[PDB]
Ligand binder design. Structure first.
Ligand SMILES: *[C@@H]1O[C@H](CO)[C@@H](O[C@@H]2O[C@H](CO)[C@@H](O[C@@H]3O[C@H](CO[C@H]4O[C@H](CO)[C@@H](O)[C@H](O)[C@@H]4O)[C@@H](O)[C@H](O)[C@@H]3O)[C@H](O)[C@H]2NC(C)=O)[C@H](O)[C@H]1NC(C)=O
Ligand SMILES: *[C@@H]1O[C@H](CO)[C@@H](O[C@@H]2O[C@H](CO)[C@@H](O[C@@H]3O[C@H](CO[C@H]4O[C@H](CO)[C@@H](O)[C@H](O)[C@@H]4O)[C@@H](O)[C@H](O)[C@@H]3O)[C@H](O)[C@H]2NC(C)=O)[C@H](O)[C@H]1NC(C)=O
Ligand SMILES: *[C@@H]1O[C@H](CO)[C@@H](O[C@@H]2O[C@H](CO)[C@@H](O[C@@H]3O[C@H](CO)[C@@H](O)[C@H](O)[C@@H]3O)[C@H](O)[C@H]2NC(C)=O)[C@H](O)[C@H]1NC(C)=O
Ligand SMILES: *[C@@H]1O[C@H](CO)[C@@H](O[C@@H]2O[C@H](CO)[C@@H](O[C@@H]3O[C@H](CO)[C@@H](O)[C@H](O)[C@@H]3O)[C@H](O)[C@H]2NC(C)=O)[C@H](O)[C@H]1NC(C)=O
Ligand SMILES: *[C@@H]1O[C@H](CO)[C@@H](O[C@@H]2O[C@H](CO)[C@@H](O[C@@H]3O[C@H](CO)[C@@H](O)[C@H](O)[C@@H]3O)[C@H](O)[C@H]2NC(C)=O)[C@H](O)[C@H]1NC(C)=O
Ligand SMILES: *[C@@H]1O[C@H](CO)[C@@H](O[C@@H]2O[C@H](CO)[C@@H](O[C@@H]3O[C@H](CO)[C@@H](O)[C@H](O)[C@@H]3O)[C@H](O)[C@H]2NC(C)=O)[C@H](O)[C@H]1NC(C)=O
Ligand SMILES: *[C@@H]1O[C@H](CO)[C@@H](O[C@@H]2O[C@H](CO)[C@@H](O)[C@H](O)[C@H]2NC(C)=O)[C@H](O)[C@H]1NC(C)=O
Ligand SMILES: *[C@@H]1O[C@H](CO)[C@@H](O[C@@H]2O[C@H](CO)[C@@H](O)[C@H](O)[C@H]2NC(C)=O)[C@H](O)[C@H]1NC(C)=O
Ligand SMILES: *[C@@H]1O[C@H](CO)[C@@H](O[C@@H]2O[C@H](CO)[C@@H](O)[C@H](O)[C@H]2NC(C)=O)[C@H](O)[C@H]1NC(C)=O
Ligand SMILES: *[C@@H]1O[C@H](CO)[C@@H](O[C@@H]2O[C@H](CO)[C@@H](O)[C@H](O)[C@H]2NC(C)=O)[C@H](O)[C@H]1NC(C)=O
Ligand SMILES: *[C@@H]1O[C@H](CO)[C@@H](O[C@@H]2O[C@H](CO)[C@@H](O)[C@H](O)[C@H]2NC(C)=O)[C@H](O)[C@H]1NC(C)=O
Ligand SMILES: *[C@@H]1O[C@H](CO)[C@@H](O[C@@H]2O[C@H](CO)[C@@H](O)[C@H](O)[C@H]2NC(C)=O)[C@H](O)[C@H]1NC(C)=O
Ligand SMILES: *[C@@H]1O[C@H](CO)[C@@H](O[C@@H]2O[C@H](CO)[C@@H](O)[C@H](O)[C@H]2NC(C)=O)[C@H](O)[C@H]1NC(C)=O
Ligand SMILES: *[C@@H]1O[C@H](CO)[C@@H](O[C@@H]2O[C@H](CO)[C@@H](O)[C@H](O)[C@H]2NC(C)=O)[C@H](O)[C@H]1NC(C)=O
Ligand SMILES: *[C@@H]1O[C@H](CO)[C@@H](O)[C@H](O)[C@H]1NC(C)=O
Ligand SMILES: *[C@@H]1O[C@H](CO)[C@@H](O)[C@H](O)[C@H]1NC(C)=O
Ligand SMILES: *[C@@H]1O[C@H](CO)[C@@H](O)[C@H](O)[C@H]1NC(C)=O
Lengths: 763, 763
């Protein structure tokens, strides 16, 4: 509630339905908590700052607070944060509290009984006692990880007294990652659901370690006795490279377990007895181990019928280069398997019969096989994997056939990189491979491919319309980081159903001058929608115009359009005129010092998104914008403009997203925003503007403005801008960083003063 | 003769034995020829400048000139250079003349009969007539190339009248490269020795084309009907991709021919009848052709018993990936073959039996096989090639086994890149290959290897002293652009005879902090002499000191020595102290803002070459140089020093090569060079110095100075430096760019004035 604040430098978000008020003071360099904080707020953000300590009077009048965040307030900085006694007892409605990165020595006392979450990561608490945990009898989620490890050493092994967590009957999630823990803290409460003991120094597991945990769902034991070969981070292998000793009858009481992580445990064998009782396991991680021989046997896979995810990445043997992948026949028992990763299983040749166990997996979607240094791989063997969604053929050497400060979620699963080409259907990610030329015979029996990534292959070829013949249903093609010779206009002609084409980073042949550059090759593409050819350094073009009846988006950044539009050369003025359906243009970083007269007349009639960022436009004309009757998102950021148009209404009748970020403008015209009621977005940040007059900023136009930025510039706070001073502190226009970034240059003592906090009584 | 010049801005070189005087005015921006040119000069250099034309009075008093160079005086610039009539008749002793890059339309007339060389490259002369060549009856070398091609088009085919060169009885070398020539200009004089007709549009060769040439030694026919696939430069294939039609009885009259170039001719067959008469052929070029099938036959090789060089690079077929290299059995007839290049013959697997024809070549030294995309290659097959000097295993994908403005020489042969490792003996250049780990078994039967290049392989391995076991006699090892984990001090221990080690560009594992970095691994290397570990970004080291009893040179540039020598951290102060025999150090680009006191005491006793370039030394102490009793070549270029030492004699008693290039020094001490008789080299260029006093620059010290630089700085030419003005124009000290780079800041009209050309009579 309370809607209107007075001088708070933190953003306020109101949710009437949720009855939640959010205050975000992230990255504000506040030495002390600012005054005037509303009593109706629910979430308080007090992240990285210069707060010396915490006082009971800080939250004296705040009784509705339900979330306090104090993450990374002192990253190892002055002395450690000190908390006065009874500093949290007054928050009866408190439910969540974060104290990560505060260099605390012991667990704070006096916490309210209503607390449900407590985070104490990146601290110096290496001792756990029941006396300090007595007050936390109603806690549900506990985060005590990253207290003693290589980044934040403490030189003392973690000590937990007997039955420390036993009386925490409400505990559900416990994390002890990177805490130098040697022994699992028995006895954990029976209500635990997620346990995170990974990246510790645990060497053995007892048979009664998880005897009472029946509701556990997620168990993590990574980093115990890890595989330290070629590790880019400090680690200590266990002795004799011994594996993490886990008894056969260890996961017996676990019946609701769903996620089990054993990554980087130096395991050599996986007994089937482990998975005898856990019949509902969904995700299993076994990466960074020594299970190369176990993959050939994989006898334990017969006890996982409901498995969804299986990770076996980077299990290669030392000084061993396998001739082929030895997949066990027990892989056919993974009926519900969806994602499979066999990376780091480096081998020479991949054959069709080696993937036979995966032929009957109906629910399999993703097959990851990248980073395996595969030399010989017949692509026609994938004709049986039509139901697969993503097939990974990454940096391995396949060649053509011959003749705590952020992330409040804390413990979260690894989110897979959702590439832009996955949404189009079947994907064959052949990026960074050893393919140096394209044959139509190689891609035979692959008409089902809706996607094909070939970035980084460094292919030097002159396509004439026959290489991608079998790819009849291809919709997305990636050809970045290659050497494409556009000597013919018939390239990609046989890709009838292609929609998006990426030929970026092909600067090699485009840099050479005097050779033909057929830029009209998009005419044959009937259903092409997006074309990305940026960072190509295109300086000449044999074709006068580019023709396309369906292209809508075109990226032409990082090229040389100045030479194409050189003074006295009108050949390429109407280069984009024939693109009738084009709606977005991205001609940026083209070293365009100036725009010759006539280019705007040659722009497509349906242009709607024009960008000229980072170009260096010394003088950009504005009366020529009348030609563009559909322009809405003109962008001139990071340019060297110096003059605003006399009347924006006379320039464009539809511009609504004008941007002039990081420009050099010292003053605005007296009628800059006169009768411009169609404008919605305006940006003038990072400029050299001095003052704004009333006649240039009418309130009628400013009322409908969604967002306006005037931060990080050189406004002068003198008596000549009383109207501006009154308006900035009495309007509802959303101006970000109003009290943090925009300051006053002068005069004299007014250096660094906040405009919204200015009250010139003498004026 | 004449020894002493007056105001010439060109360097003068005297050779009394050769009676030659050389004047070099290269890159001087001279609008007109300066006055005071000696009459005794022999060679005149008048390269790229702003000379408008040539007048007869330019060489009026010069009668001893024997060489005039006028190369690239106007690169397509004002209008073309105009030569007045009878502008060269007065040079009776002229023998050589260069007029390249002058946009001349016709051959200049009135040349003296004593001329022997004439260069007219990069001009607009596309017509040749006997009338203009009548005056050149005594010429020997003619250069008329690059007159009409893609860089300098003329849109007209070259026209040569019948028997134009017939009467040039003294002609020996003729060049017509890039001249758009269609037909060979019959009839060439019988005294021709070198013919250069390459990069032309010749489509056919007549049987009488070379009927009279019996003394010809070098013949070039490259670029005629060229192979235009993947060409980074403009080219036009002949029609029907026809080959250059050469009759069988074409090289019949040629008996002294030694070099024949047929590179890029689209040849398909090489008849043996071509080489029937040329029994003394030494170098043969057949690259960029379609002789992939001909290599399997190679029937013509039986007629080349005296061949020395054979080039067959880049003859791969389009859309064809050969399974293996098909070398003909006729290769055994090349008894005298020394260098063989089979690059661009892309094939999958290389086997031992495929190199059988080369097993009996006693004189074979270099075997080039790079850029072939070889996948499988057993390195043990090279045990039979012990006599070979260089074996090329370049960017192909071999993996570990599984289970006119310059170049006055004009027409010169392609100089092979002499890598630094070739001088050590047998070389196995395995750079940029697909090797990702090292096994001792792979390098078996290779104990004869004196060199091994492994740069760019990106190998991630933790060597412990057993990988390079069979390489007992290895002396040079290159490991640049890799990922070396120095977790053990026993690395390279088994390389007993190693002398030079290069572990540069291994920044990956060295950038990580907290992992061990055993920098004392050089102790085991008993005979190590040079160690290059630059650009490694080394910021921490587990070993306190580096020990080596034989290391003499150490490159440690592009690292982080500031963190190692951080204030309050004296652990790594004596890092290089134990290097007893070290004589050269290259610690540069280390971001060293300042040198903490004590590092000089920890320097090796025998240090002689110290470099601190591009470091950013805000304040470098000088009294600590007394510790270094053997310093001679101290370098502080591209630094931010501001104060010179009070007395250089008191600082170092052996410094003789002090360098302060690109520094920021405004003034020198009044006793900077007092009693410093041991100094030989001094550099103060690109500084902010204002004036020099007499008491700081005694003549006794300056007499023995070999070289001194005071160019490109901010000297002020007022009346306060009369002594300096007198001394700079009356001393014999070699001061480069004395009248071209060093100018006067002021005062007033004295901007840009030459100090050596200053005469202040009013002072
Ligand atoms: C202001 O502070 C409030 C608390 O003081 C915040 O309310 C919290 O909001 C989160 C959601 O953002 C709730 O989390 C719930 O989690 C359960 C369990 O889901 C678990 O599993 C999923 C994966 O399937 C995982 O993503 C979750 O993180 C959990 O691990 C869900 O079923 C719920 O729908 C909900 O997501 C908290 O319970 C809730 N706390 C309280 C006390 O209600 C509020 O978000 C804060 N607002 C801002 C703007 O920061
Ligand atoms: C000043 O001008 C003088 C002429 O006006 C220059 O004298 C010339 O010097 C060059 C050497 O630099 C002489 O070239 C001769 O070439 C023959 C034939 O060798 C040929 O083959 C070799 C490869 O085996 C090749 O490298 C050569 O370039 C030749 O193509 C050699 O046998 C000789 O030893 C010598 O190298 C000229 O003959 C000579 N000209 C005259 C008229 O004597 C002088 O070099 C100029 N000085 C400077 C500093 O520029
Ligand atoms: C995780 O806990 C283990 C518990 O052992 C820590 O190992 C201990 O580390 C300290 C500090 O390096 C060792 O103290 C050392 O003692 C030697 C004398 O033996 C002394 O010369 C050193 O200066 C240092 O004080 C201690 O011995 C060692 N414990 C054992 C059993 O070896 C480990 O450091 C902890 N990890 C982190 C990141 O804090
Ligand atoms: C085809 O495959 C290539 C390589 O696998 C993909 O390129 C990679 O795309 C990812 C995601 O866009 C890039 O990651 C990003 O890197 C930047 C730094 O450049 C970082 O700031 C981002 O946060 C993100 O991590 C990755 O760099 C890029 N790799 C290269 C070599 O460009 C490409 O996206 C694939 N194409 C399709 C259509 O899936
Ligand atoms: C090397 O010599 C050949 C000799 O044929 C040159 O080819 C000629 O090039 C000119 C200029 O492009 C052509 O003139 C053209 O004529 C057409 C009408 O046919 C006109 O529309 C053009 O505007 C141009 O004026 C000429 O036809 C052509 N000769 C032949 C037989 O095709 C070639 O250009 C020369 N190469 C260089 C680098 O100068
Ligand atoms: C081992 O093989 C590698 C690659 O074949 C060699 O590196 C290459 O060395 C040459 C000659 O030093 C470099 O050429 C130079 O390039 C610079 C530009 O960086 C240019 O300014 C010079 O004029 C010269 O052309 C080449 O760049 C370099 N390549 C790489 C990737 O570094 C290496 O020298 C070999 N090692 C031994 C001991 O022979
Ligand atoms: C694939 O892996 C399986 C299981 O490790 C291998 O089968 C074993 O092979 C060894 C060596 O011959 C025998 O001693 C075992 O008795 C075999 N066990 C079983 C259950 O068959 C198999 O040889 C591997 N195949 C390949 C090609 O490496
Ligand atoms: C990859 O596999 C496919 C199919 O298994 C092979 O296609 C065969 O090609 C030959 C010659 O073109 C035909 O005679 C066969 O009938 C094809 N097989 C089928 C099932 O139709 C292809 O040759 C394989 N690739 C390589 C390099 O061997
Ligand atoms: C596209 O390029 C391919 C590759 O060169 C052409 O295929 C060749 O065509 C020529 C002329 O008909 C034949 O002599 C070759 O035998 C063909 N090679 C192969 C491997 O088939 C193809 O004709 C070109 N297409 C167009 C329209 O230019
Ligand atoms: C793209 O433009 C080029 C010209 O820049 C077109 O090439 C011309 O094609 C016609 C028709 O065959 C020929 O008569 C001309 O001689 C060609 N000119 C050149 C310079 O090659 C090409 O056809 C265009 N492609 C498309 C698909 O429109
Ligand atoms: C290596 O090259 C030789 C010469 O081109 C090949 O020998 C020819 O092979 C063809 C095809 O079988 C025959 O028609 C010719 O009669 C052969 N000529 C001779 C002189 O033998 C040979 O087959 C090639 N070998 C490989 C493995 O490609
Ligand atoms: C590369 O060639 C060498 C020699 O030709 C092979 O060395 C053989 O290795 C086997 C098993 O180690 C021995 O039984 C043979 O006696 C060796 N040959 C000789 C001549 O001694 C080596 O195996 C080859 N590499 C590969 C990958 O096959
Ligand atoms: C250097 O590293 C190699 C590779 O690990 C070591 O060779 C292994 O040594 C262990 C211990 O003796 C054996 O169990 C393995 O069988 C060996 N592997 C191979 C491929 O031989 C070697 O011992 C190490 N040497 C030193 C001095 O540490
Ligand atoms: C290089 O220096 C490291 C120390 O930085 C040496 O490692 C020590 O070796 C001794 C002898 O075995 C051990 O007692 C120490 O515990 C080791 N210290 C560490 C930190 O590992 C290493 O031996 C040195 N190598 C050489 C060749 O001198
Ligand atoms: C124009 O581009 C911006 C870029 O963020 C986008 O937000 C906007 O929706 C685009 N406008 C149209 C009409 O597509
Ligand atoms: C500017 O706008 C006014 C008012 O609509 C109009 O009268 C005038 O013609 C316009 N001028 C230009 C150059 O568009
Ligand atoms: C020191 O290095 C320079 C670098 O050019 C070299 O010329 C000089 O000979 C070296 N001095 C000694 C004594 O090796």
């Amino acid at each position: 509630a309370r809607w209107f604040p007075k001088t708070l430098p933190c953003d306020v978000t109101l949710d009437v339905s949720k009855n939640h008020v959010i205050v975000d003071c992230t990255d504000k360099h506040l030495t002390e908590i600012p005054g005037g904080i509303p009593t109706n707020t629910t979430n308080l953000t007090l992240t990285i700052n210069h707060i010396p300590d915490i006082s009971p009077a800080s939250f004296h009048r705040l009784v509705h607070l339900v979330e306090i965040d104090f993450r990374c307030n002192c990253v190892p900085c002055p002395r450690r944060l000190q908390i006065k006694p009874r500093s949290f007892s007054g928050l009866t409605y408190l439910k969540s509290l974060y104290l990560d990165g505060n260099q605390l020595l012991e667990i704070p006392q006096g916490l309210p009984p209503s607390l449900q979450l407590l985070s104490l990561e990146a601290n110096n608490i290496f001792s756990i006692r029941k006396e300090q945990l007595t007050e936390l009898a109603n806690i549900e989620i506990l985060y005590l990880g990253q207290n003693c490890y290589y980044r934040n050493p403490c030189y003392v092994s973690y000590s937990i007294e007997k039955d420390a967590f036993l009386n925490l009957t409400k505990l559900k999630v416990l994390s002890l990652k990177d805490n130098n823990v040697t022994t699992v803290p028995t006895v954990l409460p029976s209500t635990l659901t997620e346990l995170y003991l990974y990246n510790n120094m645990i060497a053995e597991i007892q048979e009664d370690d998880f005897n009472n945990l029946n509701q556990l769902q997620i168990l993590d034991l990574s980093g115990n006795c890890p595989r330290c070969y070629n590790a880019p981070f400090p680690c200590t292998p266990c002795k004799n490279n011994s594996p993490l000793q886990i008894p056969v009858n260890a996961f017996d009481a676990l019946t609701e377990l769903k996620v089990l992580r054993l990554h980087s445990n130096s395991l050599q064998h996986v007994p089937p007895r482990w998975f005898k009782n856990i019949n509902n396991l969904q995700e299993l991680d076994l990466s960074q181990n020594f299970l190369a021989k176990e993959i050939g046997d994989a006898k334990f896979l017969h006890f996982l019928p409901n498995l969804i995810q299986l990770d076996l990445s980077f299990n290669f043997e030392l000084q061993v280069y396998r001739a082929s992948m030895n997949l066990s026949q027990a892989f056919s028992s993974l009926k519900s398997l969806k994602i499979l990763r066999i990376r780091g299983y480096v081998f020479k040749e991949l054959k069709s019969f080696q993937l036979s166990p995966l032929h009957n997996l109906q629910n399999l979607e993703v097959l990851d096989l990248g980073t395996n240094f595969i030399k010989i791989a017949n692509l026609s063997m994938f004709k049986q994997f039509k139901r697969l969604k993503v097939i990974d053929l990454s940096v391995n050497k396949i060649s053509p056939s011959g003749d705590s400060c952020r992330f409040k979620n804390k413990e979260a699963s690894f989110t897979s990189v959702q590439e832009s080409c996955y949404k189009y259907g079947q994907t064959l990610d052949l990026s960074k491979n050893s393919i140096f030329f394209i044959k139509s015979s190689d891609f035979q029996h692959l008409s089902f491919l809706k996607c094909l990534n070939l970035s980084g292959n460094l292919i030097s070829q002159t396509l004439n319309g026959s290489e991608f013949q079998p790819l009849a249903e291809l919709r997305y093609l990636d050809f970045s980081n290659n050497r494409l010779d556009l000597l013919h206009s018939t390239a990609f002609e046989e890709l009838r159903k292609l929609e998006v084409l990426d030929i970026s980073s092909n600067s090699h042949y485009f840099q050479s001058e005097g050779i033909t550059h057929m830029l009209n090759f998009t005419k044959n593409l009937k259903v092409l929608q997006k074309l990305m050819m940026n960072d190509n350094d295109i300086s000449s073009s044999t074709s006068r115009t580019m023709e396309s009846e369906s292209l809508r988006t075109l990226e032409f950044r990082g090229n040389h359009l100045d030479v194409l539009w050189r003074d006295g050369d009108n050949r390429y003025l109407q280069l984009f005129k024939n693109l009738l359906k084009l709606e977005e243009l991205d001609i940026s970083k083209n070293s365009l010092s100036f725009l010759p007269s006539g280019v705007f007349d040659g722009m497509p009639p349906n242009l709607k998104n024009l960008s000229l960022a980072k170009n260096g436009l010394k003088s950009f004309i504005w009366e020529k914008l009348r030609y563009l009757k559909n322009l809405e998102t003109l962008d001139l950021s990071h340019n060297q403009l110096t003059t605003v148009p006399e009347r924006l209404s006379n320039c464009s009748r539809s511009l609504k997203n004008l941007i002039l970020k990081n420009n050099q403008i010292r003053s605005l015209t007296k009628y800059f925003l006169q009768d411009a009621f169609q404008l919605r977005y305006l940006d003038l940040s990072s400029n050299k503007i001095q003052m704004i007059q009333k006649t240039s900023f009418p309130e009628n136009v400013l009322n409908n403005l969604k967002m306006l930025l005037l931060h990080h510039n050189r406004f002068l706070c003198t008596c000549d801008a009383v109207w501006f001073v009154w308006w900035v502190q009495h309007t509802e226009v959303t101006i970000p960083y109003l009290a943090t970034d925009v300051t006053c240059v002068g005069p004299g003592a007014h250096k660094g003063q906040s405009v919204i906090s200015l009250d010139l009584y003498t004026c």
